[PDB]
Subunit: 82 residues, 5 copies
């Protein structure tokens, strides 16, 4: 899994029916790093540090084994909680 | 998933039957970046910025759990 | 599979329910390399060198074909054989 | 999917039984780039530019969901 | 699939039971390249150039669709530079 930060919500799109209403977020490992897009399975806001899963796990994490995702946020990271 | 841009249509006449008639597009993260090829499941043209999915999800995104794809366009993006 | 070292525990109180109670660990191929996170399926401590599996094998290794993992620690490496 | 060129046939006499008799070819994104190996599901020769799929799609592309491939040639690109 | 050279055996005494008794080998694309670990399904020795498969194919390649592997040696390369 990857540690990434939420930059912004991906709204400016028209996409496929096989994807539902779960939000898409633009994420990166840090500012300036290459951007990716993840399905938000938790409920995140810009600036949140999030745990991201790829591969097959990303699909069922997004809510279905049939979900079109290869990157899904499955947790919010507590930077300071120990 | 990754945002990419469509450079051009990929022409491959000799290809396996499992691919069917789905259009294949050459895509890149940006001009000059490594070229990859994606199945277009939306209907795109050169210059379009597109949302692409890989892994297992690219197959069913292309229209079947058995489809031979590891990269599929699942959306067009305006603002890039 | 990758050879990585455990740096520390990753705390995510708000994570999806399918993760159960599995511990998550911050791992890297060496200090300074990009950090990743793996589910601990062995019982590891910081400083341990660990064998990590990704792809679909990470899921069942973490305890279920339905488990949300793409990186799972499946062994501790005895570096001084 | 990636665009790659066939360099040569990969000869591996001692390989697992699951591989059958499918040809294996050494491929690269261009000369001098890191070499990889793909199962040839099309019928290629050295010099061919080819379309290759990875991930789980490579297996069924090679002919079976149980086939041991993570990289399969699924087309010949008309521009060589 | 990758062409790699076998460097040495990977000793992991504390590893998940699903691994069985399959040998694990340290492999790299060339000396000095990043080390990975593959399950040996052929029977290899150090110095061998080997064909390695990853992704989901590595599992059944290692003996079972349930096997915890994302890198499996599935062939020995005849005469390799
Ligand atoms: Cl994969």
């Amino acid at each position: 899994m990857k540690i990434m930060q939420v930059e912004k919500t991906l709204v400016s799109t028209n996409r496929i029916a096989d994807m539902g209403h779960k939000p898409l977020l633009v994420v990166w490992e840090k500012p300036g790093a290459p951007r990716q897009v993840a399905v938000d399975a938790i409920g995140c806001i810009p600036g949140d540090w999030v745990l991201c899963v790829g591969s097959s796990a990303a699909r069922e994490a997004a809510g279905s084994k049939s979900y079109p995702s290869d990157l899904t946020i499955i947790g919010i990271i507590d930077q300071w909680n120990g």
